[PDB]
Write an enzyme that holds these catalytic residues in place. Structure first.
Site, PDB file in Angstrom:
ATOM      1  CG  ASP A  85      22.070  -5.128   8.265  1.00  0.00           C
ATOM      2  OD1 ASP A  85      22.096  -6.402   8.254  1.00  0.00           O
ATOM      3  OD2 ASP A  85      21.947  -4.395   7.265  1.00  0.00           O
TER       4      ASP A  85
ATOM      5  NE  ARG B 189      18.434  -5.786   7.335  1.00  0.00           N
ATOM      6  CZ  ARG B 189      18.630  -4.466   7.236  1.00  0.00           C
ATOM      7  NH1 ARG B 189      18.710  -3.717   8.308  1.00  0.00           N
ATOM      8  NH2 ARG B 189      18.878  -3.911   6.067  1.00  0.00           N
TER       9      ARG B 189
ATOM     10  CG  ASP C 258      21.457  -1.753   3.561  1.00  0.00           C
ATOM     11  OD1 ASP C 258      21.369  -2.899   3.970  1.00  0.00           O
ATOM     12  OD2 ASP C 258      21.628  -1.459   2.419  1.00  0.00           O
ATOM     13  CB  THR C 259      25.646  -2.985   7.550  1.00  0.00           C
ATOM     14  OG1 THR C 259      24.944  -4.257   7.643  1.00  0.00           O
ATOM     15  CG2 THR C 259      25.474  -2.198   8.844  1.00  0.00           C
TER      16      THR C 259
ATOM     17  CD  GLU D 246      24.121  -8.223   2.714  1.00  0.00           C
ATOM     18  OE1 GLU D 246      24.320  -9.338   3.272  1.00  0.00           O
ATOM     19  OE2 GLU D 246      23.124  -7.502   3.012  1.00  0.00           O
TER      20      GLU D 246
ATOM     21  NE  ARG E 279      15.683 -10.241   7.685  1.00  0.00           N
ATOM     22  CZ  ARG E 279      16.384  -9.488   6.846  1.00  0.00           C
ATOM     23  NH1 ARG E 279      17.702  -9.620   6.804  1.00  0.00           N
ATOM     24  NH2 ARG E 279      15.788  -8.543   6.162  1.00  0.00           N
TER      25      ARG E 279
HETATM   26  C1  LIG Z   1      15.063  -3.300   7.357  1.00  0.00           C
HETATM   27  C2  LIG Z   1      13.876  -3.974   6.692  1.00  0.00           C
HETATM   28  C3  LIG Z   1      14.078  -4.851   5.645  1.00  0.00           C
HETATM   29  N1  LIG Z   1      13.061  -5.470   5.009  1.00  0.00           N
HETATM   30  C4  LIG Z   1      13.274  -6.350   3.879  1.00  0.00           C
HETATM   31  C5  LIG Z   1      13.339  -5.453   2.641  1.00  0.00           C
HETATM   32  C6  LIG Z   1      14.272  -6.167   1.704  1.00  0.00           C
HETATM   33  O1  LIG Z   1      13.567  -7.059   0.753  1.00  0.00           O
HETATM   34  P1  LIG Z   1      14.474  -7.806  -0.308  1.00  0.00           P
HETATM   35  O2  LIG Z   1      15.202  -8.980   0.311  1.00  0.00           O
HETATM   36  O3  LIG Z   1      13.308  -8.265  -1.122  1.00  0.00           O
HETATM   37  O4  LIG Z   1      15.456  -6.894  -0.924  1.00  0.00           O
HETATM   38  C7  LIG Z   1      15.187  -6.895   2.709  1.00  0.00           C
HETATM   39  C8  LIG Z   1      16.449  -6.123   3.022  1.00  0.00           C
HETATM   40  O5  LIG Z   1      17.159  -6.772   4.053  1.00  0.00           O
HETATM   41  P2  LIG Z   1      18.729  -6.972   4.012  1.00  0.00           P
HETATM   42  O6  LIG Z   1      19.322  -5.576   3.837  1.00  0.00           O
HETATM   43  O7  LIG Z   1      19.026  -7.694   5.316  1.00  0.00           O
HETATM   44  O8  LIG Z   1      18.995  -7.816   2.791  1.00  0.00           O
HETATM   45  O9  LIG Z   1      14.515  -6.968   3.912  1.00  0.00           O
HETATM   46  C9  LIG Z   1      11.753  -5.165   5.388  1.00  0.00           C
HETATM   47  O10 LIG Z   1      10.817  -5.778   4.791  1.00  0.00           O
HETATM   48  N2  LIG Z   1      11.509  -4.370   6.420  1.00  0.00           N
HETATM   49  C10 LIG Z   1      12.485  -3.650   7.034  1.00  0.00           C
HETATM   50  O11 LIG Z   1      12.192  -2.898   7.972  1.00  0.00           O
HETATM   51 CA   LIG Z   2      22.357  -5.364   4.681  1.00  0.00          CA
END
Ligand SMILES: Cc1cn([C@H]2C[C@H](OP(=O)(O)O)[C@@H](COP(=O)(O)O)O2)c(=O)[nH]c1=O
Ligand SMILES: [Ca+2]
Length: 129
Positions: A15, A29, A34-35, A37, A75
């Site tokens: 993702d 991103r 959510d994919t 890891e 991102r």
């Molecule tokens: C998809 C997305 C993720 N995020 C943030 C939330 C999560 O915070 P935390 O890192 O604090 O868990 C993290 C999840 O991304 P990943 O799934 O790439 O880890 O990215 C956003 O803020 N906005 C979004 O639209």
């Molecule tokens: Ca992920």
């Protein structure tokens, strides 16, 4: 919403993808998904799927939603298209991603992706198997 040009710099995982957007390298991103890891079940398959999709595209497009365009890690937050097919939807439809991270005002394609998830779940694909 509007499709904008970009070019692949490098596949990353299920993702995220590194693209050149308005001439600057950025990690994107994928909105609303959510994919797993890489080290979790279906993680390698999701990375492989996304990689193939972005590496085979002759045209990559970025589509920001109505709300924040960058997240707290810097991102880019977008819908990404490979030859007019949305990566976000494609991953969900194959059961390689779940609909997730649905925040208000960056949720244009929520129902489209939920519809794909419902079909992927019906077919017991990958994550749903
Ligand atoms: C998809 C997305 C993720 N995020 C943030 C939330 C999560 O915070 P935390 O890192 O604090 O868990 C993290 C999840 O991304 P990943 O799934 O790439 O880890 O990215 C956003 O803020 N906005 C979004 O639209
Ligand atoms: Ca992920």
């Amino acid at each position: 919403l509007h499709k904008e040009p970009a070019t692949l710099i490098k596949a990353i995982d299920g993702d995220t993808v590194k693209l050149m957007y308005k001439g600057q390298p950025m990690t994107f991103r994928l909105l609303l998904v959510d994919t797993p890891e890489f080290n979790e079940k279906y993680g390698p398959e999701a990375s492989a799927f996304h990689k193939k999709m972005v590496e085979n595209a002759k045209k990559i497009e970025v589509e920001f939603d109505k709300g924040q365009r960058t997240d707290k890690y810097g991102r880019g937050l977008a819908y990404i298209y490979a030859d007019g097919k949305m990566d976000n939807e494609a991953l969900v439809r194959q059961g390689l991603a779940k609909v997730a991270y649905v925040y208000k005002g960056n949720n244009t394609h929520e129902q489209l992706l939920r519809k794909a998830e419902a079909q992927a779940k019906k077919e017991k694909l990958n994550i749903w198997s």
